[PDB]
Amino acid sequence: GVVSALSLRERIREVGLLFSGCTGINDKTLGARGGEVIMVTSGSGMGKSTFVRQQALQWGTAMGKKVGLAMLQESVEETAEDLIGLHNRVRLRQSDSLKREIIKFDQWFDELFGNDTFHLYDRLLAKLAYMRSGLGCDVIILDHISIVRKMIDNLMTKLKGFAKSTGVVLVVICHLKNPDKGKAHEEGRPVSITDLRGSGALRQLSDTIIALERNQQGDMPNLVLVRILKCRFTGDTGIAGYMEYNKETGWLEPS
Amino acid sequence: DGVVSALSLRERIREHLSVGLLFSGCTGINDKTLGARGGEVIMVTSGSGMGKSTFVRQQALQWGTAMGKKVGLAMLQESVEETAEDLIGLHNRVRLRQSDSLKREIIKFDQWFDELFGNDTFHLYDRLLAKLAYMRSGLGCDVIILDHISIVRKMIDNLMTKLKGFAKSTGVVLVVICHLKNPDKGKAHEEGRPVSITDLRGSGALRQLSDTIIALERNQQGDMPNLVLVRILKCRFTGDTGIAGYMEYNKETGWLEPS
Amino acid sequence: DGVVSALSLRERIREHLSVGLLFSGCTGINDKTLGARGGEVIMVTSGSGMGKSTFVRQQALQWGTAMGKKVGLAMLQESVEETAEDLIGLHNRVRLRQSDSLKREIIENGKFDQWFDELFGNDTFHLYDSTDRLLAKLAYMRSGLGCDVIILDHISIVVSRKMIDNLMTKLKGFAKSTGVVLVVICHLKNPDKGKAHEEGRPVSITDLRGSGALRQLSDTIIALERNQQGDMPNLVLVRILKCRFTGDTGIAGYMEYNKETGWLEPSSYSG
Amino acid sequence: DGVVSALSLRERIREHLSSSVGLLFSGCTGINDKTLGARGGEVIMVTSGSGMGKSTFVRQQALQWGTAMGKKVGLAMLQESVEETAEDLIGLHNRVRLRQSDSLKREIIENGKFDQWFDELFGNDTFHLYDSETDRLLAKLAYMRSGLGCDVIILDHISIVVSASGESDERKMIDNLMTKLKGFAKSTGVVLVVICHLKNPDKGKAHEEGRPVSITDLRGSGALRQLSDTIIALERNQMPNLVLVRILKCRFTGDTGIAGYMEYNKETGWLEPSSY
Amino acid sequence: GVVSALSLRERIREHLSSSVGLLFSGCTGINDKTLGARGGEVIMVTSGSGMGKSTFVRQQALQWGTAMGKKVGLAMLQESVEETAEDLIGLHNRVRLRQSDSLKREIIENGKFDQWFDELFGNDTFHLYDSTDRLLAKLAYMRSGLGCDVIILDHISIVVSDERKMIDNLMTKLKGFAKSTGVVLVVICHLKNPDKGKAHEEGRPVSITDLRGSGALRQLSDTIIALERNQQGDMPNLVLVRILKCRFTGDTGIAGYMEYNKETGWLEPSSYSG
Amino acid sequence: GVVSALSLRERIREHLSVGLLFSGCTGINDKTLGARGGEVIMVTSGSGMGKSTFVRQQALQWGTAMGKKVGLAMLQESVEETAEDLIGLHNRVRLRQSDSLKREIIENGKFDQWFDELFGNDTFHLYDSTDRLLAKLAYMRSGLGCDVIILDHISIVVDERKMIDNLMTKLKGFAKSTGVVLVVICHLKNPDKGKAHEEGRPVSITDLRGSGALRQLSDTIIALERNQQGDMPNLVLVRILKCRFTGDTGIAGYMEYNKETGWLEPSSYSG
DNA sequence: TTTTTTTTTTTTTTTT
Numbered sequence A: 001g002v003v004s005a006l007s008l009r010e011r012i013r014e015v016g017l018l019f020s021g022c023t024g025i026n027d028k029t030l031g032a033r034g035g036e037v038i039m040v041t042s043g044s045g046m047g048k049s050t051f052v053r054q055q056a057l058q059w060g061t062a063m064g065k066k067v068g069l070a071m072l073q074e075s076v077e078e079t080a081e082d083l084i085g086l087h088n089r090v091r092l093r094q095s096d097s098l099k100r101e102i103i104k105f106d107q108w109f110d111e112l113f114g115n116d117t118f119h120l121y122d123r124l125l126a127k128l129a130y131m132r133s134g135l136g137c138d139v140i141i142l143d144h145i146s147i148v149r150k151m152i153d154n155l156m157t158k159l160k161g162f163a164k165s166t167g168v169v170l171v172v173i174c175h176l177k178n179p180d181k182g183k184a185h186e187e188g189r190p191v192s193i194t195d196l197r198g199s200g201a202l203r204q205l206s207d208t209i210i211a212l213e214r215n216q217q218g219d220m221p222n223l224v225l226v227r228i229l230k231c232r233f234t235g236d237t238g239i240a241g242y243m244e245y246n247k248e249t250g251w252l253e254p255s
Numbered sequence B: 001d002g003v004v005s006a007l008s009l010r011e012r013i014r015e016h017l018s019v020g021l022l023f024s025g026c027t028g029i030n031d032k033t034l035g036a037r038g039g040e041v042i043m044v045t046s047g048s049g050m051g052k053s054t055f056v057r058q059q060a061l062q063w064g065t066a067m068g069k070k071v072g073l074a075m076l077q078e079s080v081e082e083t084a085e086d087l088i089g090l091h092n093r094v095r096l097r098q099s100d101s102l103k104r105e106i107i108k109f110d111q112w113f114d115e116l117f118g119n120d121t122f123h124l125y126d127r128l129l130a131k132l133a134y135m136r137s138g139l140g141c142d143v144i145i146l147d148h149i150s151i152v153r154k155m156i157d158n159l160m161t162k163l164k165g166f167a168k169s170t171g172v173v174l175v176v177i178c179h180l181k182n183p184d185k186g187k188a189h190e191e192g193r194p195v196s197i198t199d200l201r202g203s204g205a206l207r208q209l210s211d212t213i214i215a216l217e218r219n220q221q222g223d224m225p226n227l228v229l230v231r232i233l234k235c236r237f238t239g240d241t242g243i244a245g246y247m248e249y250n251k252e253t254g255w256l257e258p259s
Numbered sequence C: 001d002g003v004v005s006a007l008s009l010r011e012r013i014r015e016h017l018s019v020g021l022l023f024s025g026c027t028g029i030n031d032k033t034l035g036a037r038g039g040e041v042i043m044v045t046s047g048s049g050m051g052k053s054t055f056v057r058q059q060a061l062q063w064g065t066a067m068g069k070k071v072g073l074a075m076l077q078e079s080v081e082e083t084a085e086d087l088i089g090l091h092n093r094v095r096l097r098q099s100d101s102l103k104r105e106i107i108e109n110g111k112f113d114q115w116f117d118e119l120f121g122n123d124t125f126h127l128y129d130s131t132d133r134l135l136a137k138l139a140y141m142r143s144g145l146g147c148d149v150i151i152l153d154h155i156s157i158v159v160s161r162k163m164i165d166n167l168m169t170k171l172k173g174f175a176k177s178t179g180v181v182l183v184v185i186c187h188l189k190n191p192d193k194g195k196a197h198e199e200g201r202p203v204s205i206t207d208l209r210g211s212g213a214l215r216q217l218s219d220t221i222i223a224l225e226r227n228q229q230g231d232m233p234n235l236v237l238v239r240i241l242k243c244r245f246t247g248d249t250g251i252a253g254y255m256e257y258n259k260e261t262g263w264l265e266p267s268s269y270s271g
Numbered sequence D: 001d002g003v004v005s006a007l008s009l010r011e012r013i014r015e016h017l018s019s020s021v022g023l024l025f026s027g028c029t030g031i032n033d034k035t036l037g038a039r040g041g042e043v044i045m046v047t048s049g050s051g052m053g054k055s056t057f058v059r060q061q062a063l064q065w066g067t068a069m070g071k072k073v074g075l076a077m078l079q080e081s082v083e084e085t086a087e088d089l090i091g092l093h094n095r096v097r098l099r100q101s102d103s104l105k106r107e108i109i110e111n112g113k114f115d116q117w118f119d120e121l122f123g124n125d126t127f128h129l130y131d132s133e134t135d136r137l138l139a140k141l142a143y144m145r146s147g148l149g150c151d152v153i154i155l156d157h158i159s160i161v162v163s164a165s166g167e168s169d170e171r172k173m174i175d176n177l178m179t180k181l182k183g184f185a186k187s188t189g190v191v192l193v194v195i196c197h198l199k200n201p202d203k204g205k206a207h208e209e210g211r212p213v214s215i216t217d218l219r220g221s222g223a224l225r226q227l228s229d230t231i232i233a234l235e236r237n238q239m240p241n242l243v244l245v246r247i248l249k250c251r252f253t254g255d256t257g258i259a260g261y262m263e264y265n266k267e268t269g270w271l272e273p274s275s276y
Numbered sequence E: 001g002v003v004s005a006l007s008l009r010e011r012i013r014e015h016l017s018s019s020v021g022l023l024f025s026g027c028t029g030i031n032d033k034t035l036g037a038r039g040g041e042v043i044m045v046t047s048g049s050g051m052g053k054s055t056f057v058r059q060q061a062l063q064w065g066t067a068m069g070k071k072v073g074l075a076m077l078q079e080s081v082e083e084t085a086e087d088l089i090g091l092h093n094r095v096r097l098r099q100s101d102s103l104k105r106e107i108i109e110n111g112k113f114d115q116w117f118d119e120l121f122g123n124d125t126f127h128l129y130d131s132t133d134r135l136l137a138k139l140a141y142m143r144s145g146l147g148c149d150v151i152i153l154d155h156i157s158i159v160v161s162d163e164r165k166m167i168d169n170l171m172t173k174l175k176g177f178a179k180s181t182g183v184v185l186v187v188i189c190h191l192k193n194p195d196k197g198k199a200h201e202e203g204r205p206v207s208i209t210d211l212r213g214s215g216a217l218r219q220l221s222d223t224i225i226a227l228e229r230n231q232q233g234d235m236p237n238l239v240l241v242r243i244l245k246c247r248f249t250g251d252t253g254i255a256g257y258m259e260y261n262k263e264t265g266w267l268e269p270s271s272y273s274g
Numbered sequence F: 001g002v003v004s005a006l007s008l009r010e011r012i013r014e015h016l017s018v019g020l021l022f023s024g025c026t027g028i029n030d031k032t033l034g035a036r037g038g039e040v041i042m043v044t045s046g047s048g049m050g051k052s053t054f055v056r057q058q059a060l061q062w063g064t065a066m067g068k069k070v071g072l073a074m075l076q077e078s079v080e081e082t083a084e085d086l087i088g089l090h091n092r093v094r095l096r097q098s099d100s101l102k103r104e105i106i107e108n109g110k111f112d113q114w115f116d117e118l119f120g121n122d123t124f125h126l127y128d129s130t131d132r133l134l135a136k137l138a139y140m141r142s143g144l145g146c147d148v149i150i151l152d153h154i155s156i157v158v159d160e161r162k163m164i165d166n167l168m169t170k171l172k173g174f175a176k177s178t179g180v181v182l183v184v185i186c187h188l189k190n191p192d193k194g195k196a197h198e199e200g201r202p203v204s205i206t207d208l209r210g211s212g213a214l215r216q217l218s219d220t221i222i223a224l225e226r227n228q229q230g231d232m233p234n235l236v237l238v239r240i241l242k243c244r245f246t247g248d249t250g251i252a253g254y255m256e257y258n259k260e261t262g263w264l265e266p267s268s269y270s271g
Numbered sequence G: 001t002t003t004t005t006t007t008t009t010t011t012t013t014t015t016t
């Protein structure tokens, strides 16, 4: 609250898992920590699932920790083909000839799935508790929560109690609310902390909020800005940096 | 359990990867979004009179003659006979439902009828989820068109979640048409205003539980209102969005041709 | 089941295809939109006091004498006696209600009953003396009288957003199930910047009160404009805003009022 | 049912066009040449700026319609109480300004001329006043039309009945009040004058400094110009008394525009016709 | 309910012999075309931000309280109670009290503080208010229970803190409080920003449509008085008074000129000729 | 809640038994008479013309030289940055502009001699970066017992009219009946035509951007002008725009800016 | 005992 001037005697004289791409994130929020609930809030088609899938790939090969996915947005094979194409630096699911040309398919399969690292998913709290106890998962990702006031808040309190009981890194993605006046978030508007559907617990029981903004109907729709909106451990919020998508490969890279 | 490890999944991916349907007119659509694919939900949104039903009816003609795929219509906006007379006139290069003399001059009616309806391609429609499940199971329909959803907040959201679950369970191409919202300040969409993704009635889940959004713009009270512009707003597969191309209507014939 | 195969539809199309009602005055209308057709919903718009009821009254007059079709008026805005007197004055070429030296002159000459059965001698016109009750009354007009044209004077006083949406869907379902020609008249909304509509401002398709459902479930929209406090408030403009069946829109023509008589007649005006 | 056929409506029309009609205005000639008076079952609305004479002209009209024409006039004035709007009519009848002079008030207290001026004006039951929820107001107006049998009813300052009522959205309340009031006026067939205000202009001159007022300047909603039969606006510039009349919408006739010029007399309070 | 106009003979006479205009001070030009203030009379007083609203209002409250016997109730919300009380005492003693620490230190020692206090507050003609629905209730308790004649409010924008509906409901409640009670009600409001031109604080003549908050404020007010002064010009203490609206008399325009005295705080009637 | 004039016999006598002087220039105190309990002071200039430097200098003068508890709420930067700014301003150096100067003071042990001379007397308090701010300022006023509270860069806290009007109303209600001097730093609106604020435009009172309620609840308004592009970039001008207490507006004096210690001195420039 | 869309009307400000 109120900080006295006597507690600045030495401070004037004055981590966890790291994020891949846009290096002003782990410079700013000091990476992810155990027991946290990270929210990734952006508009439609802004690259939420792509960013969290890149994070999941960089936390399953360079980190080696057991990663449990909850992709209720698409099937379990397409999200694996996206991982294989991302890892192999080549846009896989959107090129027609290469998908039958490479079938060395076992060579590209086993190089990234030789371990028992990744655990995909086709009640949900019991499934995540099983993924946490019987499998040793350290990163749990949930992509779509809007299908899973009072029932939203009870679900969020139950997820927060599960996270406090376990100590697992948890990344949950939800959507934005429809702007009522002016332009939209998809065309150059910064995301506020108010812009959240469902209820108001998304900015209360979470620990950090990451937003991505790009002008989709513009001259360069592949040049995002990343914004931190909340961070209980640091307080450093605002602009992180800029990334490009690199449409040949699909890796989000800062520049 | 419902857990699936990444190790025991080499078969299910191999049988999965072992473009899809194309769009006719303004060929910078399948140059941009690479045409339609399976299991999708496609939204076609424009203003009143902009040419939504004309575009989807031309697409339904072009997917039932050269493709031969089973097409299931749901034209809740109009009757079941006018939507067939428009297909007959469009296939026969003649503005049929507007010329009174030719409608009685041709009656060669069966000659124009059998050439396009000799197959079991098209299945029309005069609870709705059970009807669409029947049209998908007992008929083999690969394309399902729904002309109007606003006559069918939570009542739209639960309906869209159930439609997306049905599309996920079946793997059917599904096109759904809804309208634009009311603009508050400035010009209207009917006089040359570009469309943002905000312009959707009902709620905001329409842009979140879909896969692509296609919009048309034409200056109706202008000098040449027969020159549409097509805009792609969203594409989860590619990301390529923006102005695709132009189509002229060719008022004598009725075919949208790219020029 | 409600599925229909396209193969088993050869006969129902043949009995279906086996122009419609023309419009009177400003002959660029029926050249452009080709008149009304059975099973439509028509919108007529203008500013306040610009003559929407005046324009639809001439059409109800010309559709009852030259056509012979059953016409059902729904004058929610006024009484039945006043619109009956205005129809009599509009047919007999004489401004009736707006002249008191003649309203007592024709009742003593005995030719009032001559002018009465000259236009009301048939069973053409059916007036309405004022939601679900209105729908039941229009259904009884359609079934129990065989009406071809049903005119609704004013829709804004029916609502005493979702209640406008449900009403418009129900009216479209009624007019499609019975196939009756249905005309609906509404007003415009207050513009925020610039001039008002009454001094010659052209009307866009946004300017519709209540909600935006008035243009998404209607087949054609006709707007009429006239510079009221101008050089002359007689030369009116007619604009087609939307048409599903024909498509061609824009300015149709130019009419004058003929203040001595009151007939909207087309006149020569290029620009 | 209500499906009245056009054939079985003969004698009704014979008893409609034979009878009412008329009830001319005062102060100007061009007003009656365009609007052709006030008729039973209509709505005539008069607007001005702030403090421009939308009450003086109407009380001057209510003096003429209650004395020289015998019609029972009911004044629902809500700006002032019944003690002042009945006192100003006496002075306007006697061609003076009674409230604006403390000499003549004490003089008519002394000599007894107040009783002569009271019983000369109110010798016949022609003026019915009302003192100040929207429910009981229409009930008292229905009591004026049914029990008292009023022929002219003047409702002044409709802005006070939309602002003293607790409503979230004001536009629907104005619309519902206007359609219920027009339903009352059409069912009863009584002449009903309703007085409302104007709103703030966006830029340019102000309405109290000579701005030519248009029809879209009505304050509160757009239901005020859609359900009225006649709209008359008054415009002057503070020649601080030269007031002109503008017909904005005539539904009966078609002649609208500049009707004429009036001059307000600072001594008597009458709206005399001008020459210009 | 409704009444007939022939049962009013016993009250129209009773209103005819009751109502008396309370004369303004500082300028005779205001009282020439307004004839004062009566029972049931809402007077709006406005000028630019810092041009002398509360000073002229405080002078009017001082002259109607200690010289005319009217019981005056103030509801000053800009300042505290002791600050406006000290300013009333210093204004009545023709000095500038709170702007001088030496005089405030001097008058507490020689015992003339009570000499200045009891000469004003001995008759008990003034009442003060110490800081939406409870405010009108306390004003009703001030009117009925205490028996005050002229109620003065200051800085209406606190009570409204959508603003247009709130200020319209508030103006309707204050008009209903003023009418059918017989109480003078003085209301102070501010001015919105001019779009183009110069500022009101630099000498622009103020029009009628500068009253911020709604358009309903000048519709339910009976008499509107505006002040102006050019503090950046050659003569920064020569104010002008403009009567914008007068429902009773109908004469609007320039009233006169007043000169403000920097040493006594009494703005007096000047003799400037435009 | 209503108190009559008879109960104020000893309260007014309690009120008679002091303005905190403005340092840096004596031309301000000639026409402002300091600042009392409940004296809202608005301080503004152009974009980067030294609002934070002048207000931090006045807080440094009021804190360690006059014995007043000073509470800052700098939202432009965090706690340690403005702490380094206070220490480097008191010790007459330019601390955050040379890395050797930050390194020299810690290698010789004189860094602890600068903390204890400033923050050892408990006369300073800082705040770490909308209704949650007022509840903490209330605990700073009541619990800690401070006298001069400063808030900077109001655009962080704040349709940008209703929010700033409610904020200014709540701050005025907090500063009234408390006995606290609350200084608020704001900005100016952008110039549309003419010269800019970085060139020496003569400022008016209606330049407070966001609303018009910032000059209606402020008690003393001070504006600074610095011509960084002209001949003298180190000369500032102080203009009083509004004084409720006295009423004297215009140029107060002249001060010269320094690029050696960070301070700015009282000058005697001639116009 | 709570979050999101649609819509007509009155005011106070905002940019490149």
Ligand SMILES: Cc1cn([C@H]2C[C@H](O)[C@@H](COP(=O)(O)OP(=O)(O)OP(=O)(O)O)O2)c(=O)[nH]c1=O
Binding pocket: A043, A044, A045, A046, A047, A048, A049, A050, A051, A073, A214, A221, A222, A223, A224, A245, B208, B235, B236, B237, B238, B239, B240
């Ligand atoms: C972020 C981004 C995506 N794209 C393209 C490629 C992506 O596969 C496609 C969409 O990105 P996705 O990350 O797949 O979007 P999403 O699944 O998170 O959306 P939602 O959950 O709201 O339905 O758009 C770009 O072209 N440039 C970009 O910067």
Ligand SMILES: Cc1cn([C@H]2C[C@H](O)[C@@H](COP(=O)(O)OP(=O)(O)OP(=O)(O)O)O2)c(=O)[nH]c1=O
Binding pocket: B046, B047, B048, B049, B050, B051, B052, B053, B054, B055, B077, B218, B225, B226, B227, B228, B248, B249, C215, C216, C243, C244, C245, C246, C247, C248
């Ligand atoms: C698309 C288009 C239509 N038209 C004409 C001919 C069409 O039959 C008519 C309307 O076309 P429709 O395709 O029927 O219009 P719509 O379905 O989008 O509108 P709604 O459902 O809201 O009523 O307009 C053109 O002239 N040029 C064009 O580009």
Ligand SMILES: Cc1cn([C@H]2C[C@H](O)[C@@H](COP(=O)(O)OP(=O)(O)OP(=O)(O)O)O2)c(=O)[nH]c1=O
Binding pocket: C046, C047, C048, C049, C050, C051, C052, C053, C054, C055, C077, C187, C226, C233, C234, C235, C236, C256, C257, D226, D227, D228, D250, D251, D252, D253, D254, D255
């Ligand atoms: C169309 C037209 C009408 N008029 C005048 C003469 C008629 O007596 C008068 C009647 O018009 P109305 O038909 O009553 O106008 P309206 O119904 O559109 O307006 P409202 O919303 O108030 O119902 O219009 C002209 O003068 N010139 C014209 O061209």
Ligand SMILES: Cc1cn([C@H]2C[C@H](O)[C@@H](COP(=O)(O)OP(=O)(O)OP(=O)(O)O)O2)c(=O)[nH]c1=O
Binding pocket: D048, D049, D050, D051, D052, D053, D054, D055, D056, D057, D079, D236, D240, D241, D242, D243, D264, E219, E246, E247, E248, E249, E250, E251
């Ligand atoms: C018309 C007119 C009136 N007057 C005087 C006569 C009256 O005393 C006063 C008009 O009083 P009102 O007519 O009662 O005021 P108003 O109705 O115009 O406005 P509102 O009720 O909304 O406040 O002005 C003139 O001096 N010159 C004029 O030209």
Ligand SMILES: Cc1cn([C@H]2C[C@H](O)[C@@H](COP(=O)(O)OP(=O)(O)OP(=O)(O)O)O2)c(=O)[nH]c1=O
Binding pocket: E047, E048, E049, E050, E051, E052, E053, E054, E055, E056, E078, E229, E236, E237, E238, E239, E260, E267, F216, F217, F218, F243, F244, F245, F246, F247, F248
């Ligand atoms: C009347 C007058 C006062 N003054 C001085 C003494 C006044 O107390 C002071 C103006 O303050 P106020 O008299 O209080 O004026 P105000 O009500 O318009 O301001 P606010 O809303 O902010 O409270 O300035 C002048 O300089 N010139 C003048 O003409």
Ligand SMILES: [Mg+2]
Binding pocket: A048, A049, A073, A143
């Ligand atoms: Mg996604």
Ligand SMILES: [Mg+2]
Binding pocket: B052, B053, B077
């Ligand atoms: Mg359609």
Ligand SMILES: [Mg+2]
Binding pocket: C052, C053, C077
């Ligand atoms: Mg009409």
Ligand SMILES: [Mg+2]
Binding pocket: D054, D055, D056, D079
């Ligand atoms: Mg009046």
Ligand SMILES: [Mg+2]
Binding pocket: E053, E054, E055, E078
């Ligand atoms: Mg003041």
